Nucleic acid binder design. Structure first.
Lengths: 55, 54
DNA sequence: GTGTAATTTAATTTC
DNA sequence: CGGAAATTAAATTACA
């Protein structure tokens, strides 16, 4: 049960609001940049888009 | 779609017998369980996926 | 008590 | 076409 940071959260949000689907070579980039694992990022995307399904 | 327990149990039996499904088996399974052969095909796919993951 | 990460299961796109 | 590998959506389960 991981908890994400603030600096990391703003980045995932920006990357989302630009494109809701992240590119594999972009997602590795983000993943090694923010220090997280590429899996966390994906699951975060899924849980994000959940909010999209709320409208 | 949500599968029943009965359906999961049938799918489970048919898989544990032979891991790869034949056309007459997906027609039969589709016709008894009420599903589409595609639903079933997908089910075998996801099953073998689970076995190779563990 | 809400909010969200992580887990299943059914369905998809691509090689 | 059917199958394998990688993602996605939908619904639920546990930590937060």
């Amino acid at each position: 049960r991981t908890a994400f940071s603030e600096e990391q959260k703003k980045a995932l949000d920006l990357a989302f609001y630009f494109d809701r689907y992240l590119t594999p070579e972009w997602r590795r980039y983000l993943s090694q940049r923010l220090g997280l694992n590429e899996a966390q990022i994906k699951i975060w995307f899924q849980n994000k888009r959940a909010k999209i399904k709320k409208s």
